[PDB]
Design a protein around this ligand. Structure first.
Ligand SMILES: [Fe+3]
Ligand SMILES: [Fe+3]
Ligand SMILES: [Fe+3]
Ligand SMILES: [Fe+3]
Ligand SMILES: [Fe+3]
Ligand SMILES: [Fe+3]
Ligand SMILES: [Fe+3]
Lengths: 168, 168, 168, 168, 168, 168, 168
């Protein structure tokens, strides 16, 4: 690359890892969408919500591909592992798995920031904080709040009205 | 499933295989998009075209997930294999690889149609013909035509003007 | 909290301290507003200006309450001390007191950033820089410029015209 | 003050006490807003309601500051005591605390009216009746009705649907 | 009067006195208007302001004539005394004279309220509070603030700019 | 300055050096614009592009002068050195010199961030990251991509069409 | 140049000198802009005026660069000398220095017109009269009129109101 400047191989490699982490998260949410689309589960607003989350995570991955290109790094793809489950259990169990995924993504992004900081990558530390860390703490808060509300509404009628009310 | 009717396990499994085929194709096009976004290749209209193709292949996958759910089948995810290459070569070679992928997708859809036909699935034979086979012969024709135009324009200035003129 | 991640008790505590600092600053500005609303002082644009500053400082406090909630910290309220004075003196003296308060708010925000940095809170260092430090240097600059203009316009007619012209 | 006429020191003092009463009530509601914004409570419409009540109580304070200035009295600020609790308990417990606060505010306003009446302040008795006592009986009725509906809806799903339905 | 009910001769007479008080105040302001319209004084916005105040005072009179009629009292006109001066002196002196007049009008309206109160005229006490005591408190505040601003702006250029700036 | 706070002489001096660096870059682009405006070169879109780049670099200088003033630093101008060349050679040679200039500018901004960081200037580190480092990596990427496309289009007809196509 | 006709080396050289004179005048006005943007001076309309004058002088330079190219001359850049001062003193002193710079610009333009006239450059004599001499006498008149008005308004309140009134 004629452009590449103050961009360490360790950071280039960590961005490639994070690209895979985001594509995997997209895959998990696509599977959770399919789950709520089952004809014996049939919660369309939750199914649509997880599809939007899947699209957003794919967007996280492609934005990191774009900054890799801007910095003059080379994207290196890895297998996208299938999610841990096809069947995600109750509404609560699925939102719990989602909170755990968002906390894992955040842990991974904090490690990426740390590597960039260790290598004095003044551009990429700010890029990660602005474009990733801010949305990540809002997503985790969102999922924690959904879990409080799913438990409060309770199974059955509460899950039915949660689907109706929550994603207006 | 209370809905499932005239829907054979062999057909449900074939639909799951095709979902993975389409997700794999989405991944290949995402990789080709990154290739043309390299700062030493820098054909942005071609990079945008392959991103659009990646989006479309993901749509093929999610629409098969939808018809799996409509028929009362259950979606089962597999690993999405990394693409065969990260380096796709020249404009011509990338479009040739894309044509090969579209013909592989078509071969897989024709096999899916044949399994549905063998099991007397009168809904799914028509669904595959209308929603997949028609689009697939159009996609293959588009890629054959792109290859003719890339060869005609030729390397260097032709590749530059193909990027400028063919997608606008 | 199911959300709380990489959020140290020291940072949670310092955010609670800064909430009180901002609520105190809001109170000081409310008192300065009442001063210029006195029938024997009667500078209505300055009174309105200090009320707007009071509103803005209360917004600074409530925004920190929101980020405390987002990070999964717990808000803890303290008494809001009455301002140092009820009589704020001349236009110049009130604006000098306001500049001192803005500099004290900034010193507190820089300390909060320091604590976040020491605890490797990569989210909150950026949050404080973006949402607080940038605003604070523009506030301090605004008050230094007001003070330059009050001095230039001078006591009596200058104060009357400053009130008429400076907030229009 | 060149304006001050038929305005007794006892009434001036009682208006300053009431300004502190309203600022305290504003703080209580700000604290209740934080409680319902906790990620493990997460009743956002209730949180926004208590923030609006906090804004309204602050407006009650600033309107009494304006009439203090109009009558030629001098505003004297006191410490704003922290609320009795940071942790306000159930929806019902918070709304019961709010009703008790509104009744305490009303008792303090009736005492203020009483002092104005005792001193033949024909302007301020009418001002208190029009601008405070009318609003205060409506607010108390509003809170009594909220409590009736919270009890009717009941804990769990009722609290979720009260938050969804009551503030729209 | 077929209408007259709970309306004492003492209150009827006090309303007729207040009508004369308001017509006198209108005449004073008309005289102050002429003063500032002198070709050797030539403060057009102040002259227009005092003409507006003269119009308002006549409105105070005619509104009291209307409520006299509504209550079934009979209007009894007295001479309108010429104002104390034709030459009102400086801007500050005219505004001081204006404030004294507003305070005198206010004392007279509080006495009228007192008479209505003594006679248990529950309609007229409230009418006087709403229609007269509120306006009078704002007018007295207005004139006190004008005097503070005349004093601040100072003589000569300050008077010229007070005329330009103070009345929109 | 009454405003200046946590703003070290070394940082103030470094901001002044960076103002000169940006003004020098503006001059270089102005020179390159004149080169492509020569009647024997006559590539008007490239000439316009380099004039826009000159305008942008001058904006980079004047924004740094603004933040110097906000922080209470004092602007100190130095001579703006004439560019290294008046004759910038071929389209490729000019764009290669531009890339080298952007990388030099980036090296200077990274040094400036480093000085701010050493002096614990929490405001200015973030300001440089947000306002300078982000744009600088995008500019460098843009110039690397221009060079790839100039080489691909090739000399003569390619340069003619590059000028026609690349800036439209 | 295939275009160059009736264009003497002495005139080509003098246009290059005048380009440097205009770029220098732009730099002086940018410095004066920074001076009025100081937090202890804070005359924003004057700061904006001098920034507009800096932009105008840069436009004078780029317009001469364009006529150099039209006539088939070659632009040759020289160092842009830093202004005489960073600190320009009072409002009057700044406008006095501006008047002197405009008079120096005019002397330089009249010398350029003289050289063109001596070399019988019938195009460039008219070009300089129309595009430079007409604007130059208007700019000198404007700066002489500003100085008259700055002295009339006087230092302190006059400078404050000159900033408010003169550039609207
Ligand atoms: Fe993500
Ligand atoms: Fe497909
Ligand atoms: Fe603040
Ligand atoms: Fe209240
Ligand atoms: Fe009246
Ligand atoms: Fe730059
Ligand atoms: Fe000029």
């Amino acid at each position: 690359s004629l452009a590449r400047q103050n961009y360490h191989d360790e950071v280039e490699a960590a961005v490639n890892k994070q690209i895979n982490v985001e594509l995997y998260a997209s895959y998990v949410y696509l599977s959770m969408s399919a789950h709520f689309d089952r004809d014996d589960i049939a919660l369309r607003n939750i199914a649509k919500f997880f599809k939007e989350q899947s699209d957003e995570e794919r967007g996280h991955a492609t934005e990191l591909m774009r900054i890799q290109a801007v910095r003059g790094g080379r994207v290196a793809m890895q297998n996208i592992q299938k999610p841990e489950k096809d069947e995600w259990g109750t509404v609560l169990e699925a939102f719990e798995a989602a909170l755990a995924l968002e906390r894992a993504n955040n842990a991974s992004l904090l490690k990426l920031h740390g590597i960039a900081e260790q290598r004095n990558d003044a551009h990429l530390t700010n890029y990660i904080q602005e474009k990733y860390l801010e949305e990540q703490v809002h997503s985790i808060n969102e999922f924690a709040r959904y879990i409080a509300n799913i438990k409060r509404a309770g199974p059955g009628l509460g899950e039915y009205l949660f689907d109706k009310e929550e994603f207006s």
